[PDB]
Design a protein around this ligand. Structure first.
Ligand SMILES: [Mg+2]
Ligand SMILES: [Mg+2]
Ligand SMILES: [Mg+2]
Ligand SMILES: [Mg+2]
Ligand SMILES: [Mg+2]
Ligand SMILES: [Mg+2]
Ligand SMILES: [Mg+2]
Ligand SMILES: [Mg+2]
Ligand SMILES: [Mg+2]
Ligand SMILES: [Mg+2]
Ligand SMILES: [Mg+2]
Ligand SMILES: [Mg+2]
Ligand SMILES: [Mg+2]
Ligand SMILES: [Mg+2]
Ligand SMILES: [Mg+2]
Ligand SMILES: [Mg+2]
Ligand SMILES: [Mg+2]
Ligand SMILES: [Mg+2]
Ligand SMILES: [Mg+2]
Ligand SMILES: [Mg+2]
Ligand SMILES: [Mg+2]
Ligand SMILES: [Mg+2]
Ligand SMILES: [Mg+2]
Ligand SMILES: [Mg+2]
Ligand SMILES: [Mg+2]
Ligand SMILES: [Mg+2]
Ligand SMILES: [Mg+2]
Ligand SMILES: [Mg+2]
Ligand SMILES: [Mg+2]
Ligand SMILES: [Mg+2]
Ligand SMILES: [Mg+2]
Ligand SMILES: [Mg+2]
Ligand SMILES: [Mg+2]
Ligand SMILES: [Mg+2]
Ligand SMILES: [Mg+2]
Ligand SMILES: [Mg+2]
Ligand SMILES: [Mg+2]
Ligand SMILES: [Mg+2]
Ligand SMILES: [Mg+2]
Ligand SMILES: [Mg+2]
Ligand SMILES: [Mg+2]
Ligand SMILES: [Mg+2]
Ligand SMILES: [Mg+2]
Ligand SMILES: [Mg+2]
Ligand SMILES: [Mg+2]
Ligand SMILES: [Mg+2]
Ligand SMILES: [Mg+2]
Ligand SMILES: [Mg+2]
Ligand SMILES: [Mg+2]
Ligand SMILES: [Mg+2]
Ligand SMILES: [Mg+2]
Ligand SMILES: [Mg+2]
Ligand SMILES: [Mg+2]
Ligand SMILES: [Mg+2]
Ligand SMILES: [Mg+2]
Ligand SMILES: [Mg+2]
Ligand SMILES: [Mg+2]
Ligand SMILES: [Mg+2]
Ligand SMILES: [Mg+2]
Ligand SMILES: [Mg+2]
Ligand SMILES: [Mg+2]
Ligand SMILES: [Mg+2]
Ligand SMILES: [Mg+2]
Ligand SMILES: [Mg+2]
Ligand SMILES: [Mg+2]
Ligand SMILES: [Mg+2]
Ligand SMILES: [Mg+2]
Ligand SMILES: [Mg+2]
Ligand SMILES: [Mg+2]
Ligand SMILES: [Mg+2]
Ligand SMILES: [Mg+2]
Ligand SMILES: [Mg+2]
Ligand SMILES: [Mg+2]
Ligand SMILES: [Mg+2]
Ligand SMILES: [Mg+2]
Ligand SMILES: [Mg+2]
Ligand SMILES: [Mg+2]
Ligand SMILES: [Mg+2]
Ligand SMILES: [Mg+2]
Ligand SMILES: [Mg+2]
Ligand SMILES: [Mg+2]
Ligand SMILES: [Mg+2]
Ligand SMILES: [Mg+2]
Ligand SMILES: [Mg+2]
Ligand SMILES: [Mg+2]
Ligand SMILES: [Mg+2]
Ligand SMILES: [Mg+2]
Ligand SMILES: [Zn+2]
Lengths: 112, 229
RNA sequence: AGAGUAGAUAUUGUAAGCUAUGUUUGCCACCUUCGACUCAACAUUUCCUCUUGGUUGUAAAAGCUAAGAAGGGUUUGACUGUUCGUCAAUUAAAAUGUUACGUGAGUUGGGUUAAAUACGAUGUGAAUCAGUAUGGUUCCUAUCUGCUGAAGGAAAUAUUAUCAAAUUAAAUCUCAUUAUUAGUACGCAAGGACCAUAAUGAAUCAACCCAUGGUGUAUCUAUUGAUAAUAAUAUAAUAUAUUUAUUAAUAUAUUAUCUAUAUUAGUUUAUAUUUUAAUUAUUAUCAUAGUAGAUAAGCUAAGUUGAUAAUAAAUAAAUAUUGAAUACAUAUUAAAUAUGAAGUUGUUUUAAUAAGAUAAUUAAUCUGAUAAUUUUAUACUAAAAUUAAUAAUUAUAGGUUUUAUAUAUUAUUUAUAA
RNA sequence: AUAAUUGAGGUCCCGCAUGAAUGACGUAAUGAUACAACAACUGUCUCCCCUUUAAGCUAAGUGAAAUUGAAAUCGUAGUGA
RNA sequence: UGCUGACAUGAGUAACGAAAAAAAGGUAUAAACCUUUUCACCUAAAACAUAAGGUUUAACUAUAAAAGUACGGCCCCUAAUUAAAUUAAAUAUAAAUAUAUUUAAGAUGGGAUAAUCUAUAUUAAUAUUUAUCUUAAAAUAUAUAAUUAUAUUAUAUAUUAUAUAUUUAUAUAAUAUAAACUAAUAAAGAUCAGGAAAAUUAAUGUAUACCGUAAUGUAGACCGACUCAGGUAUGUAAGUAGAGAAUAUGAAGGUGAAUUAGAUAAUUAAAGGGAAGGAACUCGGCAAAGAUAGCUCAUAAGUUAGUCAAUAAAGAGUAAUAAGAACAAAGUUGUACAACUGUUUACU
RNA sequence: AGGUAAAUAAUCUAAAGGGAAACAGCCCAGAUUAAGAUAUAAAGUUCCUAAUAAAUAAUAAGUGAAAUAAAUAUUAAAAU
RNA sequence: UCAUCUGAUUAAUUGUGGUUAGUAGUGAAAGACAAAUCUGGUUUGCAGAUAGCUGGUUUUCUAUGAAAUAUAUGUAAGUA
RNA sequence: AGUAUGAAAAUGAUUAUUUUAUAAGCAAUCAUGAAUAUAUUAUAUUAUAUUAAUGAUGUACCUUUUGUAUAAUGGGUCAGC
């Protein structure tokens, strides 16, 4: 149930790193994407090219934003009177800074 | 009960409902991204549904047709955005696949998602129309788009097309009128080139497309095999 | 000594004598949990099975006693916390121990056990008991050793792909009944064989799923209650087209089936009024898979199939031959020569190992791995199958087609037509 | 009573060491009390099998604990606080 | 088993706390945030109103808006109770203090007027607990004033038509569902016999103070060291069903979560089914299984006479005959002890 | 009885070193620090392991070879 | 926690406030509770209580080097 | 819980040298090959340093005891006290 001794430096290290099962393997199965000449996984789509195509689809197949007439044709002063500004909470501010906590996809290296 | 399908870490009732939802979403949006296992199971359902629809369309037996219809109805959630999904299935989706013997979907593997390391895939409908009757482009048929992008890249590099690319193009063609296919390719080029910001001289592009079509369409050792002494 | 019809030594063996054991009850004080379940390993001082000596007390058959022998086997119930014991029904037999009186970081907690309480006894009393009774508290994710499986790395009498012997590590090894020999041998009769073979079983082990049985959150049908859809039809509105003389009629698309007021405070329902405010087909969800009847694959034992591994070799107790030493005698603790066991060696089976063998040898497709589709396999791995698309041949999974199975209605039918 | 009963009920009385408000005795009802029997039922068992979900296993992210003189931490027999 | 600090070990091991998710888009930044659609879960709640509490957690700093009427506090009044207070000498007392009496405080309670909307100031003058039956009345049908059977029976409002003050008032008549529920009324059964305390006319007034108000509240926003399956007061709690607030469903509302994705060996947990047998299990039938109406009938011995036993066991009617939601309903007996309903070692 | 109680001596206690397989107490011998030629103690001298050759008898049982197991039995051998 | 079980118009359950506790209250009585546990709470102080008991007590070198017996002891864990 | 500074240790990762995949126990000491590094007197047949070839010897430390490798006490490591 309980360790009888302080496990030594040797014995913890040979346990962890000695076996190949536990080690990380080289990703030999990279290959060139045909659409953009960059690294991608074998039997896998290029995340750049498919992303680009998805973006294209979004730009074309776009549901139009609903802008109400009455709010679109308000005067500036009138709009200010109706819908004044406010102090956002700390939480709200944190939520707003998305680049702080949201990871954008990195581009791979160009294949040789 | 064991081995017939993926369990997907869900109770039976939930699992089936999930699969139905996935099928509905596939029919609505002609491609969808999801986890690999879910996609694989969803394909099985969607394909089955398509075949049933085809059978209903074709069969002379009235009772059979009615039974197929009932089965199709059972296998979908018809509400909200999928109210007129049955109609779409009969009129829009299933008529694409009348000549095609199975294989109506394609699950294309993606790079696994970062937060979760979950293997990610794209379940999508085969031979989805890239251009509707309105002057727009349609969401779906990712593989075709990718192929055309690869072709464009090859043209830019002034390289020959890869054998695999040619094979894929041939596969795409098999259930496609040649002129229609060409027109689709041309349409894809217009969008793709602009996105990538390469110049679109139209006549030259058309000629290239034609050349690509021609080679696709017109079909043309270490050990020796010797009889026993 | 003495019993044993006679004779101490077939069998029995007073009291006293000499030892072994560490299985009991003690003594010492170095040293501060009984039973059940589960799985057992070891011993032999052998209960059964195999071999054999003795048995006026071995005629036969049952026995009794002794030698070899640990291969295989050695019980299920009623009572009790019990081990034990009493009994019942079996068995070839129901052997005796050792293993922290094996086994509580494996289970249990009935006994023993503290707090509550009562009874009998003891005590002035608080309370007490080699007493009785009801109730009643420990938990632990495994670091190392070890064991069960599974990989990676490795040094290979030097490579890879395959086939692989000796060997090593284990497994296995049976037993009963009936039948025949034979109602023979033996015996006055009653009774009743050895030697040996066969067939049924047995307990154990292994594999298997064709069939049978079970399951089957694959599936199908039935079914109660409530809700929610799609389709069709009707009505109404809006939008888009066509006709007609914006209006009406038609076609397509979309949305809608509400609402409000009365019946003496409130709520619900009902009807009436108000409004265009619909009733059939088919689905789904929820209620243990809602419940119930069937049920494919797989998995399984209630099921099926096989095995209990020979022949052979050397032996144990025991039984002999010739034959001295020792004129006889003596199977030899002499030389020679023979028999002899469920034991030993082996044999058979599994796992490991890889001596050896065939082939190829810097590669337009050498051998492996990474990758994909997977299952023959599987915790992860590993293993095995496939990764075809060109001059030919190769289907891994899904999908498709197919025949087949399941479900449950169906000739009162389906399809072609005249 | 059971094939078989150290349990249960009935009865006997060498009551080791019963007994009358530390109440004595016999009942009806009640009791999650204790013991025993019959019925029915059943995976409790003969004797386990199949299925379901949550864990277990793998990948990603986060990240305990008791413990620990130091450890390069095998078997057997012998020895020996 | 020193104290403090730092850092190891177990170990990148267990675990990440009852849980249903999917896609598309915000965004070629999302398992976790927002939106839309689908799916599910809670639904006499996981909803909607509130009380208490609390690092304001909120839909936020440009922030929770009150003269009063199905608005609370504050205020007036007092209960339980409290008070270095109160009365040459209230009484007692080593000191502290304690007692009795006064006065003051003290809500968990009582408190005028109001949609015809309403006016609170000042001055002057003399209600334990339970029940709404039976009878009687008239109404509706059958038969031949009287019988039989059935509901109805105190209050709550709009309409219409009359009669009196003069379209505004008062009274009368007639018209008009069922089932729950409310308040207010009346009469009244039982013993356990049911708070306290704070006037009316007239004249003159009344420019209406302060505080509470977010959200959370069967919970991530309180008490439990944690965003803890524990603890936490009250009122509504769509319909369909039913005796019902049981049970099923779920209109609406709210929610789907600081872990995910796969795989589903051994093994564990929590479930479902099981041939032949049926307690052979075990200390012990522990656990599991077992319900052939839940309504209406019927129901024994014994017995303290209490359908106590009884919800008796069996059994009948209605329903169903191959079965086909949930929930309520789980035997009979003998003995020991204790009359009984209760109480007890919060945690063996 | 590795028991208990005291008597005498020694060692251990508080004593390292060699031997007794391993060893608090037995057999030798007392570490001031080294050095390593010579005498040695107890104990040893086939190898493990530092060091050996002989003589005369006996055993044949692996008896025994650093922890001696008895009465009794059988078979020899001497002496009378 | 889940299942199962018991009471559920009463010696019922429960909100809000109050009274009674450290020789000490409350207790349908279990030494039961009195702020996560009482045969008598907690805090501060006496206080560095006391401990014939346990454990600990820190550099080096040099010389000598015991005892575990008798007697006494409310003494046999001590002390003379 | 001052301010500077900080090659103090425990502890982690990495690199270099050296040894290590037929070998068994306080991980040290002594013997003794080899490999590496440094060396302005290595003149060398050199010297020092580092390093588990191989061989031999070697039962942690303290406390408390008649007596402890003890499977008796106590300590996870280092720093300060
Ligand atoms: Mg369900
Ligand atoms: Mg099919
Ligand atoms: Mg005689
Ligand atoms: Mg005798
Ligand atoms: Mg023997
Ligand atoms: Mg005979
Ligand atoms: Mg044999
Ligand atoms: Mg034992
Ligand atoms: Mg243990
Ligand atoms: Mg007594
Ligand atoms: Mg109990
Ligand atoms: Mg089968
Ligand atoms: Mg079959
Ligand atoms: Mg069958
Ligand atoms: Mg089957
Ligand atoms: Mg299905
Ligand atoms: Mg009303
Ligand atoms: Mg309508
Ligand atoms: Mg529900
Ligand atoms: Mg068989
Ligand atoms: Mg044989
Ligand atoms: Mg002769
Ligand atoms: Mg002879
Ligand atoms: Mg033989
Ligand atoms: Mg190929
Ligand atoms: Mg195939
Ligand atoms: Mg072919
Ligand atoms: Mg296929
Ligand atoms: Mg008897
Ligand atoms: Mg019994
Ligand atoms: Mg007595
Ligand atoms: Mg008397
Ligand atoms: Mg008396
Ligand atoms: Mg009771
Ligand atoms: Mg080692
Ligand atoms: Mg210290
Ligand atoms: Mg992990
Ligand atoms: Mg683990
Ligand atoms: Mg571990
Ligand atoms: Mg885990
Ligand atoms: Mg959670
Ligand atoms: Mg997205
Ligand atoms: Mg309701
Ligand atoms: Mg909520
Ligand atoms: Mg709320
Ligand atoms: Mg509030
Ligand atoms: Mg007052
Ligand atoms: Mg007050
Ligand atoms: Mg008040
Ligand atoms: Mg509010
Ligand atoms: Mg809090
Ligand atoms: Mg806590
Ligand atoms: Mg909670
Ligand atoms: Mg409910
Ligand atoms: Mg809803
Ligand atoms: Mg059965
Ligand atoms: Mg049956
Ligand atoms: Mg039994
Ligand atoms: Mg038994
Ligand atoms: Mg039970
Ligand atoms: Mg009677
Ligand atoms: Mg029940
Ligand atoms: Mg009682
Ligand atoms: Mg209680
Ligand atoms: Mg308790
Ligand atoms: Mg001493
Ligand atoms: Mg001395
Ligand atoms: Mg010595
Ligand atoms: Mg000296
Ligand atoms: Mg010998
Ligand atoms: Mg010896
Ligand atoms: Mg009752
Ligand atoms: Mg007591
Ligand atoms: Mg406390
Ligand atoms: Mg207590
Ligand atoms: Mg003092
Ligand atoms: Mg002190
Ligand atoms: Mg001296
Ligand atoms: Mg002395
Ligand atoms: Mg003394
Ligand atoms: Mg003393
Ligand atoms: Mg080596
Ligand atoms: Mg050794
Ligand atoms: Mg020693
Ligand atoms: Mg130790
Ligand atoms: Mg040790
Ligand atoms: Mg320790
Ligand atoms: Zn690309």
């Amino acid at each position: 149930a309980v360790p009888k001794k302080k496990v030594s430096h040797q014995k913890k290290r040979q346990k962890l790193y000695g076996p190949g099962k536990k080690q990380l393997k080289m990703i030999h199965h990279l290959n060139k994407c045909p659409s953009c000449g960059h690294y991608k996984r074998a039997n896998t789509l290029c995340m750049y090219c498919v992303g680009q195509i998805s973006h294209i689809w979004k730009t074309h197949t776009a549901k139009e934003e609903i802008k109400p007439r009455q709010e679109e044709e308000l005067s500036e002063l009138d709009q200010r009177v109706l819908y004044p500004g406010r102090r956002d909470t700390k939480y709200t501010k944190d939520l707003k800074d998305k680049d702080n906590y949201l990871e954008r996809r990195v581009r791979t290296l160009k294949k040789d | 009960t064991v081995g017939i399908a993926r369990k997907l870490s869900r109770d039976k009732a939930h699992r089936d409902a999930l699969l139905k939802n996935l099928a509905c979403q596939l029919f609505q949006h002609e491609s969808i991204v999801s986890t690999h296992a879910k996609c694989k199971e969803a394909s099985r359902v969607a394909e089955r549904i398509i075949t049933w629809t085809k059978r209903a369309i074709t069969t002379s037996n009235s009772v059979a047709q009615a039974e197929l219809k009932s089965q199709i109805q059972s296998q979908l959630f018809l509400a909200g955005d999928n109210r007129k999904l049955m109609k779409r299935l009969f009129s829009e989706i299933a008529p694409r696949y009348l000549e095609r013997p199975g294989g109506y979907t394609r699950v294309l593997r993606l790079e696994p998602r970062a937060n979760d390391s979950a293997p990610q895939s794209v379940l999508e409908l085969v031979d989805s129309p890239v251009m509707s009757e309105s002057h727009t482009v349609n969401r779906g048929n990712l593989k075709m788009w990718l192929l055309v992008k690869s072709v464009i890249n090859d043209d830019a590099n002034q390289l020959p097309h890869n054998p695999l690319t040619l094979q894929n193009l041939h596969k795409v063609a098999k259930f496609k009128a040649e002129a229609q296919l060409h027109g689709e390719i041309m349409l894809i080029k217009q969008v793709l080139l602009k996105e990538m910001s390469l110049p679109y001289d139209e006549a030259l592009e058309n000629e290239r497309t034609q050349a690509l079509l021609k080679e696709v369409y017109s079909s043309s050792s270490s050990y020796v095999m010797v009889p026993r002494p």
